[PDB]
């Protein structure tokens, strides 16, 4: 699984140690071995939502299966409150798009997961 | 909805007001208030467009609903046109990716739309 | 045709003429006029794969068709070979979703391609 987060909040405001939470807390969600999670943090970005530039993330969620309407409502509590706790950033000024991906449309290691 | 461009122009060349600019304009076009709007505009990018390092743009627009041929060629119209009299980007160097999203599998404030 | 590689390798280990070996391996890999290819690098990411910061990439290819399971083989075999002499980064750790787009979803020059 892939996830990335852009968000305005700076750089220093994101605390040691957040890229192995998402890391940790993805695996337990997916039920995907962490060396299989991905993830990835963009700071500082230029981006409003609703109109305003208070703090605000738009992220995205790849995964071989694991993606359905139970399993993004949970993704999303859990998402959401990482971002809240970590970043300070309201969950209603969060999106996720979240893609599943077939094996054969994820390249890997020279090839692909098909 | 999501709009992002990522560009070559540098920071100093995206005006003041552009975010807002693109907040309402895609409000009208979409049919959609501007509080579920999310714009996000990244300057400064290492990118070519038909080998060339001219001024290009590489976006998307993800959006549940209001995607479809005719709404997206009025959208292509509208972007390229903001994006060349703001940023002075030729419309043949500006590539738009539509995403139509199902609501099950958009995230926002601890759950997804459905 | 479309290719985003966002990295932790830093700026200064991106080798001067990568975005045009990109370019131009992949208007032969995909068979697209050269004109049509755009590519963008994006180094300094604070990123993970595994839960390691060890060199890694999140890719992407967009393509108006041309993708299936052993053309994105040949893509992974062609850009993880490319990222590992250039970027020095194992092939095990790229990741690269292939994203097939209808024509009707691909917006340049003030329209579509539909
Ligand atoms: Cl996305
Ligand atoms: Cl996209
Ligand atoms: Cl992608
Ligand atoms: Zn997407
Ligand atoms: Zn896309
Ligand atoms: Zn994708």
């Known amino acids: 699984p892939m996830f990335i987060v852009n968000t305005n909040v700076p750089r220093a405001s994101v605390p040691d140690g957040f890229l192995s939470e998402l890391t ?33 993330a738009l992220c995205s969620l790849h995964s071989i299966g694991k993606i359905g309407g139970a399993q993004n409502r949970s993704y999303s509590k859990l998402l959401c409150g ?30 692909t997961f098909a």
């Open 24 to 56: 940790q807390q993805l695996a337990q969600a997916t039920g995907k071995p962490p060396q299989y999670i991905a993830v990835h943090v963009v700071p500082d970005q230029l981006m409003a939502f609703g109109g305003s530039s208070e703090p605000c």
């Open 82 to 111: 990482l971002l809240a706790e970590r970043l300070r950033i309201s969950p209603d000024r969060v999106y996720i798009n979240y893609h599943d991906m077939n094996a054969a449309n994820v390249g890997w290691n020279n090839s």
